[PDB]
Structure formats: structure tokens, C-alpha cells
Design a protein around this ligand. Structure first.
Ligand SMILES: Nc1ncnc2c1ncn2[C@H]1C[C@H](O)[C@@H](COP(=O)(O)OP(=O)(O)OP(=O)(O)O)O1
Ligand SMILES: Nc1ncnc2c1ncn2[C@H]1C[C@H](O)[C@@H](COP(=O)(O)OP(=O)(O)OP(=O)(O)O)O1
Ligand SMILES: Nc1ncnc2c1ncn2[C@H]1C[C@H](O)[C@@H](COP(=O)(O)OP(=O)(O)O)O1
Ligand SMILES: [Mg+2]
Lengths: 733, 34
């Protein structure tokens, strides 16, 4: 008696079968899954004239909630339903249209860049359509398909209509990246890279999964900016923010050079108003495109611990404090060096100086360790310099305090960054971290929005799916097939800021990390707490780094080494296996499988196409696609729940039907001594800083309170293994 | 068993069939070498 509205817009009487047939399909080859469940769960409410599209969308969200530990398969069921639904809005039918017709039509619509037709010919598109395997859309998971549907797929924001499939994404993104390649190997890479991203072998950032083949050439995930102690530099840094924030890219401010409050200006014509006043200006700049004033644009501000206004900066994210002196919309990262921790252990005081009062003391902080201990102790006895004595035990407590309450206050060991980094602490020292704290690239203050001398550290992210390769030797292909794609991107994309282009084309740095690490250890039957993976972690990453350098090495001969390279340690015949924390030889003995002395001579001649090739970053959005564990972070639960944007999606861990025992859920670990112990081993082969985060469960401590004794313990433990930085500090709620 | 082994086809039928510690010690951490 009731009627329904079909997609085309035709109307026919309601028929249950139509739903039964569909659900029965996606349920094919699945177990512990029942068709009736979805239908009733859906509580679908028929009503005269109901659009068939709505009915489909309701059943999908139904089988979506089914996903559970008892019946995981459901998350392939919903996924299959989602893709079927997507194929309707994209092509009006399940069977996808010719790769060539699809690009042509889109170009006329203004979806894909018109260069695709000027770089490739019709005869070639038909040749690439063969590599495509639309049957790979079923290898996805509800958690993955849901992401592509919301963001990754090229779809109208206003209407919400889809325009392409998951496969057309990979085939195109790889092709654009290799567009400027020789006709002899141009199509070649397009295939291998395609069967590398579609097969879940390599994970690519959100700005990349979406953009390439979009007219927009903006693929920068985040930008690091170093602000100088000037009004001109501040405005330049502020304007630089408003530029990238509108591009939805993370920001990494260092105001740590701004003189403290009370500091005299131009001899004494005026006194500094303080840091807080300026810090706020930066926030609004990051929120300038945020909706409401609340959410979006993420920016981490850094500064030295020995700073004079440190005590006033650590409590910025704290409520108490009228806004006059507060900033709860920005993250922070207290920079610490060896000397600092020393004063803590001995329970000795820390002198709080100012950047202007102590000349060279600031630069010593990163570029040189010994000079710092000489100047610091020097300015301490000097009474002609404003300072302040504070117990190292108290300062470190106030930091961990705000770090435990907010869980945003990050830590950055500048000594390790300049101790074991590709960059020469004398020419291009690391004095910054990106929002996530994974990047460690040099930066320079800008005198204006278009300053030439300025250098805005930029980077290209990527990662290897450890749960996709059989052996470590398989990284040999992925490495070269990855470094090239990213390297070419640096030239494919544009730069809205001179300083940005300067550093981008200068050292051409890249950030390639790893994903699905949890599953990796699961297969080999390893854990974190016990640390029975220290050797494995050493061997695995040893290759990950070897092949990356070996890849950027061969690339250098073909296109030359980066222009600024002489700056890098690699030029002076220096490898990470030399400047690594010697204290790592107490938690691992895994020898070098790969003959680096060989790469040493190779790089010492041609160099590297890129300055930095290895970065470990936290990747939930990217990993969700490969249905893998976010970055190296262990699964919070067998069936972690991620809510985005509109609704939470249940994502079951990989190979749960056979790995249930193996996995060591985050909450479940005794402490962090085991986790951080692995990060230090990884850093031994990372040119860039791992965004490792701590974890604390008040249920494992007496009085249901986390003791400050343990907080400082892990902090020192990490520093002992060369841990560069510390990300979040998840507190079990 | 006359019929082939199978997972239950209607699991729904079973629904009707039943703070921060401030503690600091210098000596305990002084033994930790950086
Ligand atoms: N006449 C109907 N009565 C009830 N449900 C229907 C009817 N027709 C289709 N459905 C269901 C089946 C699917 O689960 C969902 C979506 O149908 P969908 O295939 O996407 O669009 P469509 O109706 O234009 O194609 P098709 O003719 O192949 O069903 O709606
Ligand atoms: N009138 C002001 N009120 C508040 N803060 C100021 C004022 N002028 C400058 N500042 C701050 C901004 C910067 O943090 C810092 C220095 O600014 P800057 O422009 O470099 O000073 P200046 O170039 O005129 O002389 P100098 O830097 O040598 O002291 O002091
Ligand atoms: N508000 C935001 N919008 C888009 N990207 C953001 C963001 N905040 C941070 N990021 C980025 C910056 C980081 O370099 C990056 C690190 O993790 P990622 O795996 O690269 O992200 P993703 O999972 O989206 O691919 O996420
Ligand atoms: Mg000045």
C-alpha cells in the first residue's frame, strides 16, 4: 500500500525483498552475522513516499553498530553496504565508468585538474584503467569506507554528492605524482605506486588522499614557524598563521625568543608588555578561520624552561586565571635540556633568565650543550642581570601538573634533537617541533610576510603498513616507490609564502613513519611492558631507515642531492648509527643486518635528495583506511571506537579472530618503562622525532591518584634512552 | 546432526530468552643516571 522514491526519481510500491536481497549480498561469505538483525535493529520507519537512498543509509548505520567483538565480520558487512551506496551517487550504478570518460567529464565539471589531460593521452588512460581493480573496494572496512565517504572522496560540500570511487583516487593520485616522469617509466611507477596504496602497503596523509587531482595544489599538513623578538617579525609570524590556518594545516610556533615582561625596549624608551599579550594574538590567528571561535586550527607553542615567564606560561591552559593571562585554545611544548634535568635530580634550583639578558645563552641551548653550561653558570653569579631562583623540584612539578590536568603540555628535549640529528647544530640546528611533535626541521624568523631570509619548515607525511609486508626486505621497493612520490610532490605543490618555499626546495625534507605497529608485534608475539620486542623493533626500523636513505640516495644521482645538504651531517659522512643514545646498548643488542658502511660511502659522494626521510607520526585518519592500529600507539581496546565527524565508528583490530591473546591493550600495560623503552630504540633510526605519548591509570596507583614520583620517573627514563619529545599523556577516565 | 552446522541466524532471539600526587623525593631519583 505504501510507496517508495527510487534514486532516478521513479516511484514504486514498497517491497521488503529489495532490502533482503541487498543485505543478503554483503552478508555473503560472512559468519556470526544475521540479516534479520540489521533489519530490526534499523527500526526502519516506512512512510508513504520514502526515498530509497534514505532507506539504504539507515540500514548501513544499523549493521555499523552490530560490529562487536563477538561478531566482528559486521564491519566488512557495513563497508560493503557503504561502497554500494557510494557507487550510486558517483556513477548512478555499481559498475564504474571508463577511466578516460570519468576524468574527461570531471575536468569539464572542474573537479580534477585539467593538466591530467595535458600530461596523459586517451590511449594511456585506457592503459591505466587495466591496473585499476574496483574489486578492491571490498577489502576496505566500515571505519575506512566511512572516512573516504566523508572527506577523502572528491564530493560536493554543498550537495553532498559523491563523484568518484576509492580506486579512482589511488590511480589518479599516483599518476599526478609521476606526471613529470619520463615516458619510459612514467606509466610504470603509476602502476607500482597504485598497487602500493590500494593494497594498503603505504599510507598517505589526508591532504594528499583528497587533493591530488583536485585543482588545489595545497597539500601541506602543517607548517613550523619561528617568530623573532620583533613587532615586524610578530606580525609576519601572525600573518603566516592566518595563511596556513585557512588551509587547515597544523602550526608550530616558537615565541620562545620573545623577551620576558619588564624587559627594556630600545635602551629604555619603553618596557615590554609581556608574552601573554602576544600569545593571544597568535591564537586568534589560528582561530581566524575556525568556526564559532572554538575548534579547528591546531597550533603548539614552544619555549625554553629556563624562561623568565615560564611559571606564567605553564598555567596558560588552566582555567583559574581571568582571560587576562590565559590561553586554553593552544597547545604547548616545554623545551628541556640535560642541565635542566640535572638540577632536578640533585634537587637544585633553576635560574629563570630572559632571552635578551643572556646573549648566546639561547643559541647555546640547542646548537651546543657545553657552552650552555658555561654561560648559564656564568650569568647566575652575574648580579647585573635580572633573574629568579626556583627549586627544580617545584618547576618540574608545576609542569607535570598542568600536563596531567590538560594533557596537552608536551615536552621537547632540545639537547637530543641537536645531539643526534641530521642537521648540524651549528648551521641548521633544531629549535622547534610541529603541532604533533614528530617533525624536527630547522627554522628561521621572518622580517615580513614575504621575507626571503625567512624559512618556514614544511614537511610531507607518509608511512609504511607493517601489517602488510611479509619481511623487512619488502621495504626496499616501498621505500623508493614512496620517497619519489613525496619528493615529486614538493615540486607539484605551490607555496603561499617565500620562506616556506625556501626551506622546502632547500633541504627538501620528508617525513615517512610507520603504522599498524601494534599488529606487527602481535604477529611476532611481542609486547610493550615486558620489552620482548626491543630486538625486533631494532631490526624492523633498522631496515625502514636503511632503505629510505638508500632510496633517497639513488634519487640524488638521478636528480641531484638537496641544495642545502652540505649543512646536513650525512654530507660529512655521519649516520644515525653514530649519534644515537649510547644508553640504548643496555636494552637491545640486535646487530646491524644491513651494511651501512656501504651507504656511508654512497651518501658521502652523491648525498641525499632529501635531508630527512624518517618520521614517526600519530595517524588515526590514515590508519583507519588500512584498518590498522593508529601509528605505534597500542589499541585502546579490541574494538576501539572512533567518533567522526558526526557519529562514532566501531573499528575492530586487524586479525582479531586469531590474535585475541597477542594484543596488549593500552590500559592493560603495567607502566611506561616498556613503551618508552621501545621509542628510544626507534629514535635510533629516526631522523625525526616520534610523537610518543605516556599513559597513566589512577586505578593502578594507591588512593586512586597518580603519584608525581612516577610522572618524573618516566620522564627521566625516556630522556635516558634518547627520547626527543613527548606527546599526549592519556589519563584513563 | 541432520542439518549443517551454522551460526545463529537471529541472535536477537536471545534478548527475549533471558587526584594528582605531589610527592617528591630527591634520593630516589638521584640514583637514576642520565
Ligand atoms: N521498492 C522498494 N521498497 C523497499 N525498499 C527498496 C525498494 N527499492 C529499493 N529498496 C532498497 C534496497 C536498498 O537497500 C536500498 C537502496 O536501493 P538502491 O539500489 O540503492 O537504489 P535503486 O532502487 O534505485 O536501485 P535498485 O532498483 O537496484 O534497487 O533501498
Ligand atoms: N610599544 C611596545 N609595547 C609593547 N611591546 C613592545 C613595544 N615595542 C616593542 N615591543 C616588544 C615587541 C617585541 O617583543 C620586542 C621587541 O620589539 P622590537 O620592534 O624589535 O624593538 P626595536 O626593534 O624597536 O628595538 P630593539 O628590538 O633593539 O629593542 O618588544
Ligand atoms: N585540525 C587538523 N586538520 C587537519 N590535519 C591536522 C589537524 N591537526 C593536525 N593535523 C595533522 C598534522 C599532523 O602532521 C598530522 C599527523 O598525523 P596524520 O596521520 O598525518 O594525520 P591523518 O591521520 O589525518 O593522515 O595530522
Ligand atoms: Mg630589535
Amino acid at each position: 500500500n505504501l510507496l517508495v522514491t527510487k534514486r532516478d526519481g521513479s516511484t514504486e510500491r514498497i517491497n521488503l525483498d529489495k532490502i533482503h536481497r541487498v543485505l543478503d549480498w554483503a552478508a555473503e561469505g560472512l559468519h556470526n552475522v544475521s540479516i534479520s538483525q540489521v533489519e530490526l535493529r534499523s527500526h526502519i520507519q516506512f512512510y508513504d513516499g520514502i526515498k530509497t537512498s534514505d532507506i539504504h543509509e539507515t540500514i548501513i548505520k544499523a549493521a555499523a553498530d552490530l560490529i562487536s567483538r563477538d561478531a566482528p565480520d559486521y564491519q566488512y558487512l557495513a563497508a560493503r553496504l557503504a561502497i554500494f551506496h557510494l557507487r550510486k551517487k558517483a556513477y548512478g550504478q555499481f559498475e564504474p565508468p571508463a577511466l578516460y570518460d570519468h576524468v574527461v567529464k570531471m575536468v569539464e565539471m572542474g573537479k580534477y585538474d585539467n593538466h591530467l589531460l595535458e600530461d596523459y593521452t586517451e590511449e594511456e588512460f585506457k592503459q591505466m584503467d587495466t591496473f585499476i581493480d574496483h574489486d578492491r573496494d571490498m577489502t576496505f572496512s566500515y571505519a575506512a569506507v566511512k572516512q573516504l565517504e566523508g572527506k577523502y572522496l572528491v564530493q560536493n560540500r554543498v550537495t553532498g554528492e559523491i563523484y568518484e570511487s576509492a580506486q579512482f583516487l589511488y590511480i589518479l593520485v599516483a599518476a599526478c605524482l609521476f606526471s613529470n616522469y619520463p615516458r619510459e617509466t612514467r606509466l610504470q611507477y603509476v602502476k607500482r605506486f597504485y598497487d602500493a596504496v590500494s593494497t594498503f602497503k603505504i599510507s598517505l596523509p589526508t591532504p594528499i588522499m583528497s587533493g591530488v587531482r583536485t585543482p588545489t595544489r595545497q597539500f601541506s599538513s602543517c607548517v613550523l614557524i619561528e617568530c623573532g623578538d620583533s613587532l615586524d617579525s610578530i606580525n609576519a609570524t601572525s600573518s603566516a598563521i592566518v595563511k596556513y590556518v585557512s588551509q587547515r594545516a597544523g602550526i608550530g610556533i616558537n615565541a620562545g625568543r620573545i623577551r620576558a615582561l619588564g624587559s627594556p625596549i630600545r635602551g629604555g624608551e619603553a618596557f615590554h608588555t609581556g608574552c601573554i599579550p602576544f600569545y593571544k594574538h597568535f591564537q586568534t590567528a589560528v582561530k581566524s578561520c575556525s568556526q564559532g571561535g572554538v575548534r579547528g586550527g591546531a597550533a603548539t607553542l614552544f619555549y625554553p624552561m629556563w624562561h623568565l615567564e615560564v611559571e606564567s606560561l605553564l598555567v596558560l591552559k588552566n582555567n583559574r586565571g581571568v582571560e587576562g593571562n590565559r590561553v586554553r585554545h593552544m597547545d604547548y611544548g616545554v623545551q628541556i635540556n640535560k642541565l635542566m634535568y640535572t638540577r632536578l635530580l640533585k634537587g637544585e634550583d633553576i635560574t629563570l633568565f630572559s632571552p635578551s639578558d643572556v646573549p648566546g645563552l639561547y643559541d647555546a641551548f640547542f646548537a651546543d650543550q657545553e657552552e650552555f653550561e658555561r654561560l648559564y653558570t656564568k650569568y647566575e653569579k652575574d648580579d647585573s642581570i635580572r633573574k629568579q631562583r626556583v627549586k627544580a623540584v617545584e618547576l618540574f612539578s608545576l609542569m607535570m601538573q598542568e600536563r596531567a590536568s590538560t594533557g596537552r603540555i608536551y615536552i621537547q628535549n632540545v639537547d637530543h634533537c641537536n645531539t643526534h640529528s641530521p642537521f648540524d647544530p651549528a648551521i641548521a640546528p633544531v629549535r622547534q617541533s610541529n603541532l604533533c611533535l614528530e617533525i624536527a626541521l630547522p627554522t628561521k624568523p621572518l622580517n615580513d610576510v614575504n621575507d626571503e631570509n625567512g624559512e618556514i619548515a614544511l614537511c610531507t607525511l607518509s608511512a609504511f603498513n607493517l601489517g602488510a609486508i611479509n619481511n623487512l626486505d619488502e621495504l626496499e621497493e616501498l621505500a623508493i616507490l614512496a620517497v619519489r612520490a613525496l619528493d615529486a610532490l614538493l615540486d607539484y605543490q605551490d607555496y603561499p609564502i617565500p620562506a616556506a618555499k625556501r626551506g622546502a626546495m632547500g633541504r627538501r625534507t620528508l617525513g615517512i613513519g610507520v603504522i599498524n605497529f601494534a599488529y606487527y608485534l602481535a604477529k611476532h608475539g611481542k609486547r610493550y611492558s615486558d620489552g620482548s620486542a626491543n630486538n625486533l623493533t631494532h631490526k624492523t626500523f633498522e631496515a625502514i631507515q636503511y632503505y629510505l636513505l638508500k632510496a633517497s640516495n639513488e634519487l640524488a644521482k638521478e636528480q641531484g642531492a638537496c641544495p642545502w645538504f652540505n649543512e646536513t651531517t650525512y654530507a660529512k659522512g655521519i649516520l644515525p648509527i653514530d649519534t644515537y643514545k649510547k644508553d640504548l646498548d643496555t636494552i637491545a643488542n640486535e646487530p646491524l643486518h644491513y651494511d651501512w658502511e656501504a651507504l656511508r660511502e654512497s651518501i658521502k659522494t652523491h648525498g641525499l635528495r632529501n635531508s630527512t626521510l624518517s618520521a614517526l607520526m600519530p595517524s588515526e585518519t590514515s590508519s583507519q583506511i588500512s584498518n590498522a592500529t593508529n601509528g605505534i600507539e597500542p589499541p585502546r581496546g579490541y574494538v576501539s571506537i572512533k567518533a567522526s565527524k558526526d557519529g562514532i565508528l566501531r573499528q575492530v583490530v586487524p586479525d582479531y579472530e586469531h590474535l585475541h591473546d597477542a594484543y596488549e591493550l593500552l590500559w592493560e600495560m603495567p607502566g611506561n618503562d616498556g613503551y618508552l623503552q621501545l621509542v628510544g630504540i626507534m629514535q635510533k633510526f629516526i631522523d625525526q622525532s616520534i610523537s610518543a605519548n605516556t599513559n597513566y591509570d589512577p586505578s593502578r596507583f594507591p588512593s586512586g591518584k597518580v603519584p608525581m614520583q612516577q610522572l618524573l620517573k618516566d620522564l627521566l627514563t625516556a630522556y635516558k634512552f634518547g627520547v626527543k619529545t613527548l606527546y599526549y599523556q592519556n589519563t584513563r577516565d | 546432526l541432520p542439518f549443517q552446522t551454522r551460526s545463529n541466524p537471529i541472535p536477537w532471539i536471545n534478548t527475549w530468552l533471558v587526584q594528582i600526587d605531589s610527592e617528591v623525593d630527591t634520593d630516589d631519583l638521584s640514583n637514576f643516571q642520565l
